[PDB]
Structure formats: structure tokens, C-alpha cells
Structure 1
């Protein structure tokens, strides 16, 4: 009575999750008008079932969001017992504050939309701001890629016992210090004032830029330069979410990175073809395990410092 569904034809990640759970993705008939008006038809009964919808990695965020919302609605009015939105990369999460302007808090709006659509539960990975859990009243499991980042570092960087973890901005301080303390190394921090300022020791050390997401990568590319200018031996970038829109791929190919590491919360395959610097940590097993635990009523906190 567990049933996993996928957003659009970007099955990829959702298929991996389903394989790991010993399941097939449920049937969904998607008819799509040219104005992008999305039609959905759940091709099997979800009556009384524990349902999980994994949002697409299609790219177009608003299409993906509506598809998700529509699919949640269809399952709720078809008497699903529970509907969980598995959203590896939370959309509009950078729009989580007003920030001295007459701005929407779009991430709160997205949380409200998910709630009124009928979501009972959220499974996500590395919310841009932890506080976003509080934008909901339903429970949220905010999974961490940290355990998998720590393990990647230990296994792929020989100098890890002597590296420096660098935040590309002031916001990311906590995230880097927590990784630096766990590994028992230093941290450093960059701040854009168009000028960057680095505080902290990177001289003669491997520098690992750690962030929750990279988009156009103008920031990490510029931070990489600064770090080499400050005497870092080489520079790595580890992001959980690899958006990589616009010139990001061109930016990374021209950059002085030794590697750019991301998870597959966003589909990376086509980006990789055109970019040899990209390596992907598979997090499908962390997503599958959180679903399995959710379903069984078993501890998921164990997924916060364990790689299943």
C-alpha cells in the first residue's frame, strides 16, 4: 500500500528511488496543451494508499510546480490515505525573506500552495534556509546531504585532514563551520561587498567551497579565483543542488576548479556531457530510505549522519 509517482518524463531520479524500494512507478497519463496547461490522470487506484510524488527535474519550475500540485490534488480527491510530496530541491527557496523590499515571501507561498493542494507530509533535501520548515504546519523532513559530502571529501581528497571549508557567502557560515568541526579542519568565508573579501586561512591548503546550491555559478567561479589568489593549492566546489542555468556550464569549464561536486536532486546527465568537471553523488538511496522509514513509522534521524 505504498505508491510512488513521478512528476513528468524526467523519471530518472524517481525511477532510481522506486528500484531501491522494489517498486514500479505508478501509471500517470499526462496530456499537455501548448499553453503548457497540464492535464493529469492517475492510471491506478490510490484509494487508501500511502502515496509519494517525486517532483520532476524537467527544468521549467512553474510547470513542474503545477504538475506536482495537480498530482497531489488528484491523489487526495481519489482518497489516498496520505500524500507526501518528495521535493529533492525546494522551489523558490531563495525567496524565503522580504529583505528590506516590498517582496513576496514566495517560499511561504509555495508552502501554502502545497498545503491547500492537500500535501500531508514533505520530504526534501537541504532547504536553503532551515526556517522554511516553519512555513508549513504539516511535518517536513529536511534531509541532509552533509553525511554524503563528508564521505565524498574523505574518500576523494587526500589532503582532507588539512583542508579548509569555505563559504561562498556570509549566509553559509554555519553550514561550513559544522563541516569543518566534524572533519576537524579550518573554515574560511567569502563576502561580496563588485568586490570579494576572504576571512580565514586558506594558504597552502586545499580549499573546498561548500554551498547548498549553485545557479549561474558566477559566485563560486569568482570565489575560486580569490582562494587561489590567497594561496590555496587547489579549489573544489561541493553543492547539494546543481541548478547550472545560463552560462554556468561555460563558467565552470573556464574556471580553476579541480572538480564541481553536486547531488542528483537535479538531473545532471546532459550537463555532464558538456562539462567534465562535474561529478554526481547519488542521493536516491537517502530519498528511498526516508520514504521507507516514513511509510513504516521508523526513525529517519539516522539518515542525518549515516549513508545507507
Structure 2
């Protein structure tokens, strides 16, 4: 096997490569004066099962992925397998207005046409898996989150909305804890919140879990409400910590700690998903 480590995923790809006792192959990469991207993989990849690890969210990450998929065609590889720990554009998985792109469809079609398999960790809406011609696997960070929190005092696991329930149910069960979710709706400029079930959180330690933290509004709001109701500790976790526009600071106004995975690397990346990705890679072989 050969593991290719793209710029966005150096940390996670390195952990994965180290665990599988192999080189994290990085490209030589630069921008030409006109801004066009240059990449080169001088290692001989012929006859190997290739695993390309890189996120697909920023314009530059997309270019890095596409050009890599061209660069590796210089070699007679056994297979080409994309692993995008965070899969960009998964939120645009249908048309919400006439004349909108299904961004996740066209991008997934492109990736599929140049690979033998695709995988990601905790995609937003599994609909997008169906846009791929090749097998598109949705890996889960559940076990990594459990391994971190088994050593934290937690009373309830909480979903900040009435989605992401399956995840919270699984994590809570593996932790041996109960769980609940928060339903937040706006009704004529006034916000109404309900806990389901209506758990008394006074003096309780709560673990809030979501797939993505981007702007952090919902989590920040729910955290404040919970603190207001007497929660003694609030831990916030998410798989993908994008942290746009001061969201970590908004959340930390009322939550005690934030812990995310290394799918998107930041100072809050304390939970590694390297094992889950390694199990997947071993399955595909090489």
C-alpha cells in the first residue's frame, strides 16, 4: 500500500501511515506565478494500492485532489482509493431552489470517475453516497469519541437539534449513559426550546455532540440555555471542527471545553480517528 498525504490532512495522514508502518507520501507542491497549482509525486507508485488522504472543502483542496488524481495516472497502480476525512459540499446535496447546483453530486461524480473507492468520516447526509458510481463508505468517529469520554464524568449525551440522534444514541449506549435532544424553533421572533425527553439538567454533566461546528450558533445557544438551567459541566464535541467567525469563543462563553477530531486539524483536535481509517484501509487491503 501507498498512503498519499495531502496538505489539508498531514496530521491525520501521518498518524495513519505510522500505524500502518508506511510512508506518508507528500507531494512537492507550489503555485506558479499566475496562481495555478503545481504538484508532483516522484515516488514509484506502480503496482500498489493507493490511498489518497485529503479534505475536499476549500477551492484549493478540490484542486489538490483533482490534480493528484491526474498525477497518479502516470503509474500503473493496482487501485486508487480516496479518503476525504471531511467531505466538502455535503450540505448542498440537493437543489433547494431552482437553478441551484447539487454541488455534492457533481463533485462526487468527478471523484468517482477517477477512483476505485471513496470514503469519508461522518458525512452530512448519506444521500451523497448515492451520487458515487464507486463504493462510497461513511466511516464513523463514534468509537473514538467514546474512547475519549469513557474517562470523563458525563451524565447525559445531548444532541443540539432533533437530527444527529442516531449518533448520540450510539455514543451514549457505548458510554452507558442516557441521552436527550434539544429542539429549537423560532416562532415570531421568539425562540422556543424543548428538551426531549424533558431531562432535569440541574447539577448534571452534559456532553453535547454534533457532526460539524461551523458558525456554532445552535451549539452556543443550547449551551447557554443548559447552563442557565443549572448544568454543572458542559463538554462540546463534534467530528469536524471548522470554527468559522469566532464560533469556538461563542461556544466557550457557556461551555467548559471543546474537543473535536483530527478530520479538520486545529488546537481543539484531541480525538484522533486514525484507527477507524486504518481499519477501513486494511479492509480494502494492501
Quick check: TM above 0.5? yes
Match of 1:306 in 2: none
For structure 2, list consecutive stretches of 5 or more residues without a partner in the other structure.
none
Q: Does 1:44 align with 2:43?
A: yes
State the match for 1:171 in structure 2: 163
Matched, 1:126 2:118: no
Correspondence 1:286 to 2:267: no
Q: Tell me how far apart the structure 2 counterparts of residues 233 and 252 of structure 1 sit (CA, whole Å).
A: 16
Specify the alignment match of 1:267 in structure 2: 265
1:269-304, Cα deviation, whole Å (9 max, x unpaired): xxx2xxxxx4611222322232123115xxxxxxxx
- Is residue 190–residue 223 contact of structure 1 (8 Å, CA) maintained in 2? no
Asked whether the 8 Å contact 2:8–2:61 carries over to 1, the reply is no
CA distance in 2: counterparts of 1:9 and 1:257, whole angstroms: 28
Q: Report the counterpart of residue 139 of structure 1 in structure 2.
A: 135
Q: Alpha-carbon deviations, 1:153-184, whole Å to 9, x = none?
A: 22112xx3xx2322222332333234344534
Query: Contact 1:53/1:86 (CA < 8 Å) preserved in 2?
Result: yes
Q: What's the counterpart of residue 301 of structure 1?
A: none
**Offset from partner CA, 1:200-254 (integer Å, 9 cap, x none):** 214223222110110122221111011222333322211011111221243244x
Scaled by the length of structure 2, the TM-score of the pair is 0.88
Name the CA distance, whole Å, in 1 between partners of 2:98 and 2:229: 35
In structure 2, how many angstroms separate the alpha carbons of the residues matched to 1:240 and 1:83? 25
**3-state SS, counterpart of residue 158 of structure 2:** strand
Do 2:260 and 2:271's aligned partners in 1 also have CA atoms closer than 8 Å? Answer: yes
Q: Would the alpha carbon gap of residues 146 and 78 (structure 1) be closer, same or farther in structure 2, given more than 3 Å must change?
A: same
Q: Structure 1 length normalisation: TM-score?
A: 0.82
- 1:237 lines up with 2:236 in the alignment: yes
Does the CA-based 8 Å contact 2:8-2:54 persist in structure 1?
A: no
Instruction: Verify the 8 A CA contact 1:6 1:56 in the aligned structure 2.
Output: no
Q: In the alignment, which residue of structure 2 is the partner of 1:299?
A: none
Distance 2:185 2:79 in 1: 44
Rate the CA distance shift 1:105–1:9 in 2: closer, same or farther, 3 A: closer
**Separation in structure 1 between the aligned mates of residue 8 and residue 226 of structure 2, nearest angstrom:** 40
Once residues 54 and 202 of structure 1 are traced to their aligned partners in structure 2, the CA distance between those partners, rounded to angstroms, is: 43
* Cα root mean square deviation, aligned: 2.3
Q: Does 1:188 align with 2:185?
A: no
Q: Which residue of 1 aligns with 2:101?
A: 104
Segments of structure 1 that go 5 or more residues without pairing to the other structure are: 273-277, 297-308
Count of aligned pairs? 279
Distance in structure 1 (CA, Å) of the matches to 2:156 and 2:220: 17
**In 2, Cα distance between the equivalents of 1:226 and 1:66?**
42
Displacement of 1:101: 5.5
How far apart are 1:32 and its partner, in Å? 1.4
The alpha-carbon deviation at position 48 of structure 1 amounts to 2.1
- CA separation in 1, counterparts of 2:136 and 2:160? 27
Deviation at residue 145 of structure 1 after TM alignment: 0.7
- Contact 2:46/2:78 (8 A) holds in 1: yes
